Homo-oligomer: A and B are copies of this chain.
Amino acid sequence: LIPTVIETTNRGERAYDIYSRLLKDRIIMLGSQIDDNVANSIVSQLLFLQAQDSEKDIYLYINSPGGSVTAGFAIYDTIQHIKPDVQTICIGMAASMGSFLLAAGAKGKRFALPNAEVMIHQPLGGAQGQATEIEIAANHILKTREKLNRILSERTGQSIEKIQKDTDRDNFLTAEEAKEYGLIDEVMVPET
């Protein structure tokens, strides 16, 4: 399914699957629903790239509907921990934890292509069982939402109260609207 690229060297042929070829140039793909497997791979790629060169930028491609919040925070905290700037670029769509991570790229280096779609909303979950178990689960997801909104406020310049209102239901943004919101810095226009 995934194509292979083969390039000529002085000692023969060099074969990569396409994504590993991009990782050679410090490009990481967040191109699926965020689960623990996806997050583990991404944070390992980040750790490896920092070790290769702690000064060159890293590029995080984001085409993702979101997914697990804790998995998203694995990626978020690793981005903040390492030294290199991590650029983010939304191509296609970034929704929920996907758009949260978009907004977490290095300031000035968060991008979207002109027709990319950005969506923000509140976290989702569930709870079954006794009243006290329901209470624990509710308190947890409310605290998780407050943590998300606080960081989003710091990253966008929007107040926490406005974030709360704007994420109560699904909120779709064009690339330009996401820039005006403070989720990205620039809509990347086509090269000449």
Contacts and interface: CB of A to CB of B under 8 A. Distances in A.
Interface of A: 1-6, 8-9, 12-25, 27, 29, 31-32, 36-37, 39-41, 43-45, 47-48, 50-51, 61, 63-64, 70-71, 73-74, 76-78, 80-83, 91-93, 113-117, 121-145, 147, 151, 168-170, 172, 188, 190-192
Nearest to A19: B3
7 contacts: A6-B14, A36-B64, A83-B191, A131-B141, A133-B169, A135-B141, A143-B172
A74 B83 contact: no
Contacts of A141: 131, 134-135
Q: What copy number does this chain have within its complex?
A: 8
Contact of A4 (B20, B27, B29, B188): B20
A91 B77 contact: yes
A127 B126 contact: yes
A129 B126 contact: yes
A70 B24 CA distance: 27
A45 B18 CA distance: 7
Nearest to A43: B91
B40 A20 contact: no
B129 A124 contact: yes
B138 A137 contact: yes
B14 A117 contact: no
A154 B189 CA distance: 17
Contacts of A77: 91-92, 113-116, 190
A18 B48 contact: yes
B32 A3 contact: no
A1 B1 contact: no
A86 to B, nearest CB: 12
Contacts of A23: 3-5
